[PDB]
Nucleic acid binder design. Structure first.
Lengths: 108, 73, 103, 85, 143, 158, 137
RNA sequence: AGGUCUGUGAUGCCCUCAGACGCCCUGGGCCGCACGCGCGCUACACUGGCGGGGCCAGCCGGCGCCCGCGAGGACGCGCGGAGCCCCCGCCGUGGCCGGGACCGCGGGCUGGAACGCCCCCGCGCACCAGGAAUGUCUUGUAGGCGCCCGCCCCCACCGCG
């Protein structure tokens, strides 16, 4: 497919910052202005090490998806268990809160 | 339920819309709407045309309501 | 010599603030000071539930604090630095009536 | 861990230097000057509390009191508040 | 205006974008009958077309009907801003477009398709029919 | 925006001082939160509100309500003199009534023979008493039982 | 003077004079705006810009030597927001149009700036009075 | 034996007391929904809706210039008040321009962090005065209209005025 005009194959290797001006307001603010904390960066670096050379579990539910985090495998915490999540290009620009459900649907 | 137009065809702007009111003495937009079963805007236009002619005169004017009198008799 | 001075007075009771005034003005007739400018009253207001818990009918307390202010700034040239103390001593000091001075 | 470091592109993205807008509320100087120490209380947030009974619920910040409502009807007479009208 | 009698070409019922429109209502309000159009968009559309806005819709000649159509499939190039469009940054194109009746169904239906496979929290609630926003539901909206 | 008790108003510092000394008379009218200040002098029959003539006022419907004292009293007197009222306070109608009260008192303060003043007072009060005497009633406070002065929050017994 | 005539006649007459004299010109953005978040749809008339300008200059004349800022003009053209299943509330107008009008008037020297805001200049008073007497009869 | 040991260096008697019910950190919940009702808000339209203009309050109270449709933002100084209403016009009995719930792109603010809140375009649910039952009210009162404070990092259909 295409990602705001950018194709998937080349979407990989993209510098988050170069693709940055083609994203929504939340990511623009958080990245270009706010910045980011050390823990998130260490998470990124651990991800990079794992890619270059096991499910990398985490508590972060406010970490945005970098394009280089594609085809990655990861688990995330809801409060009681770790929830694996598979990534895809349309998944980019979004926080992991959406992809790890914190509860179950209600059936009487 | 009830449908009313907003645009005469040729002759209805004479056979009734005018020929039938000129006999009246006092008239009003909603009265002429309920009489000729046509929406009010057309009535406004026609009354403007008539005051242009001079047959009727305004006695009380206002955005909510204006009414006329038949001077021609 | 001449400095253009101001006197502030603050209080929560109307009687002392109206008694300090008479003394000070009576004392300053010679130096050229003149009466006050009674300022707008500052109304502190608090509404609180009359109960430590939610129960029964909902009844409210209505506390308030009035603060009164009188300002004589009419000393100025009529009073020099040293002579100001002459006026702040003969008056009857009251335990609660802060009076501040500033040119 | 005093010698570790990351790619610079991963270091230009750190947070805004302008410290934080989450300082604790201190009424006077007596409170503070500003291993486990690394994380004992790093969660810096407001903790304004009744200067009488030390409670974080129902504190009147109006006029700079910081007095609970239940810890207030008792001392209102001393402070100067009077119940009229 | 000042139009009493009907134009010889006055058309009593008009058909556009597979939708049918009456010829006695004013133009700017009639066009609201379509999906993807409203009052704000319409005036900004007619006006660029050098069309009058207070004329009964049925008396719209044929020449105006096209130019009005042209500025509606080609909004941006004709000048209208990018903040007056119902689709601002497409997911695939990255463009700013204005989509209409034939498209609303597809772009919406295709949106939810993307949310089920992505497994978002929002998509599932679109399935059992809850509230996607954070509205409370304990005591409201009882079928 | 204007309170009605301001020193600038009861003195009318708006007017230039040299002319200020001509307006011998002063007057007051009110209603609710509304005040009227009439500085009056000799003239040839003119009137003004906030730099506005009397006819071109906003109560196109109550213009006669403002003009009443003129018609009930006659014209020669008012033609004799001139005014320039200023008003400040809540609402439009309140201001209308304040103004008419102020006019009545000011014109009635001009005569010098108190017998004439009494006769005119009797003539005027007969038509209405509120052209001469201020209206006392005023907004009443509200209580915590409910959302109104006298009405209460609806009570459910079950 | 000017206050011895109702505003409605003066405003329209002056706006017509102004449009005839090319004193001010409608920019591009005047044809897709709604004039304030409070407003619901855009204006019907095609020459509201000139009416607004006339009203604003009359407002600058009334205040005389006193100064006005733009945001103080926006609070005299406010309205009421509706359509929110919530109690209504008041909102301020937009200030881009007002800024354009005052800047254009100042460029014509009818309007001299001060320390804060702007105030009428004697030329503007001259012109306003002249037209006022022109329409007096 | 109404409520409050969950307001307190107010407290009697029991139970917790080094894998702690002590204190601190990371996430989540208190907002979850086939369902019954209590206090409110918005509406069912012509005694009206929309567009432009004119214009007056009080508890009390902070403004200029420039960008941006707007929300908001960058600079720099101490200075300041609304809705109803009135006037001119469009609509013309149609679940229609009444009503704006629901939902889909987008732009911003708060904050360490949106699940929170604003603005723009589009979509446009019921609702035609509401059964058995029932509440409040006598002058500046009922009702209608809006404006400030409380808690509050953002947020008022709430409450005191």
């Amino acid at each position: 497919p295409n990602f705001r005009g950018v194709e998937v194959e080349k979407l990989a290797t993209m510098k988050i910052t170069d693709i940055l001006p083609k994203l929504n307001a939340r990511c623009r603010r958080r990245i270009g202005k706010h910045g980011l904390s050390m823990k998130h960066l260490r998470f990124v670096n651990k991800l990079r090490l794992r890619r270059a050379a096991k499910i990398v579990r985490t508590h972060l539910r406010d970490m945005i998806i970098f394009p280089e985090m594609i085809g990655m495998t990861v688990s995330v915490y809801n409060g009681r268990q770790f929830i694996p999540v598979e990534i895809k290009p349309p998944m980019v620009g979004r926080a992991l809160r959406e992809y790890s459900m914190s509860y179950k649907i209600v059936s009487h | 339920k009830v449908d009313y137009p907003t645009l005469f065809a040729d002759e209805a702007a004479m056979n009734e819309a005018l020929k039938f009111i000129k006999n009246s003495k006092c008239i009003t937009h909603t009265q002429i709407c309920e009489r000729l079963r046509v929406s009010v805007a057309l009535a406004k236009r026609v009354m403007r045309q008539l005051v242009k002619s001079g047959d009727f005169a305004i006695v009380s004017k206002s955005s909510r309501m204006t009414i006329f009198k038949n001077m021609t008799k | 010599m001449h400095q253009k001075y101001t006197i502030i007075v603050v209080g929560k009771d109307l009687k002392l603030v109206e008694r300090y005034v008479k003394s000070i003005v009576k004392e300053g007739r010679a130096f050229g000071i003149s009466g006050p400018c009674r300022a707008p009253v500052r109304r502190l207001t608090i509404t609180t539930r009359k109960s430590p818990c939610g129960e029964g009918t909902n009844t409210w307390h209505r506390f308030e604090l009035r603060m009164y202010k009188r300002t004589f700034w009419v000393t100025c040239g009529g009073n020099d630095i040293s002579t100001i103390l002459s006026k702040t001593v003969v008056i009857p000091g009251i335990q609660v009536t802060v009076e501040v001075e500033e040119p | 861990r005093n010698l570790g470091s990351c790619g610079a592109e991963d270091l230009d993205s750190r947070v805004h230097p302008s410290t934080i807008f989450w300082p604790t509320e201190a009424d006077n100087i007596n409170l503070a000057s500003g291993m486990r120490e690394t994380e004992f209380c790093t969660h810096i947030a407001h903790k304004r509390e009744c200067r009488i009974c030390g409670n974080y619920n129902s504190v009147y910040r109006k006029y700079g009191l910081f007095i609970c409502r239940r810890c207030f009807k008792e001392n209102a007479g001393k402070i100067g508040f009077v119940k009229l009208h | 205006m000042t139009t009493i009698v009907q134009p010889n070409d006055y058309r009593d019922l008009l058909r556009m974008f597979n939708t049918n429109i009456q010829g006695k209502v004013v133009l700017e309000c009639a066009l609201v009958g379509i999906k993807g159009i409203g009052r704000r968009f319409a005036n900004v559309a007619l006006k660029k077309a050098n069309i009058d806005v207070h004329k009964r819709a049925g008396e719209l000649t044929a020449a105006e009907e096209d130019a009005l159509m042209k500025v509606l499939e080609d909004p941006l190039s004709h000048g209208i801003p990018a903040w007056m469009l119902n689709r601002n940054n497409d997911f695939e194109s990255g463009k700013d477009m204005h989509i209409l009746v034939n498209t609303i169904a597809s772009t919406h239906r295709a949106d939810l398709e993307r949310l089920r496979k992505t497994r978002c929290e929002r998509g599932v609630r679109h399935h059992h029919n809850l509230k996607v926003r954070g509205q409370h539901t304990k005591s409201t909206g009882r079928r | 925006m204007a309170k009605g008790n301001r020193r600038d108003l009861l003195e009318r510092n708006d007017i230039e001082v040299r002319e200020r000394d001509k307006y011998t008379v002063h007057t007051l009218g009110k209603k609710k939160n509304s005040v009227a200040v009439a500085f009056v002098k000799a003239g040839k029959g003119d009137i003004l509100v906030n730099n506005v003539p009397l006819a071109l006022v906003r109560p196109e419907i109550l213009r006669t309500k403002v003009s009443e004292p003129i018609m009930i009293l006659g014209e020669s007197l008012f033609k004799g003199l001139d005014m320039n009222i200023k008003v400040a306070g809540g609402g439009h109608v309140s201001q209308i009534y304040a103004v008419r009260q102020a006019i009545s008192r000011g014109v009635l303060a001009s005569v010098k023979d108190e017998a004439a003043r009494s006769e005119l007072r009797a003539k005027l009060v007969s038509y209405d008493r509120q052209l001469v005497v201020s209206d006392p009633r005023r907004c009443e406070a509200k209580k915590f039982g409910g959302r109104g002065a006298r009405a209460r929050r609806q009570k459910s017994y079950r | 003077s000017v206050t011895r005539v109702p505003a409605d006649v003066f405003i329209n007459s002056f706006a017509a004079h102004l449009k005839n004299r090319g004193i001010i010109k409608c920019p591009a953005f005047t044809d897709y705006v709604k004039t304030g978040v409070s407003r619901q749809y855009a204006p019907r008339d095609a020459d509201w810009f000139y009416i607004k300008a006339a009203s604003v200059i009359r407002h600058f004349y009334i205040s005389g030597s006193h100064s006005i800022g733009v945001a103080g003009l926006a609070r005299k053209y406010s309205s009421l927001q509706k359509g929110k299943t919530t109690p209504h509330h008041t909102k301020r107008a937009s200030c881009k149009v007002i800024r354009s009008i005052v800047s254009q008037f100042l460029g014509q020297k009818l309007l001299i700036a001060g320390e804060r805001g702007r105030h009428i200049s004697p030329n503007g008073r001259k012109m306003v009075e002249d037209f006022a007497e022109g329409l007096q009869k």
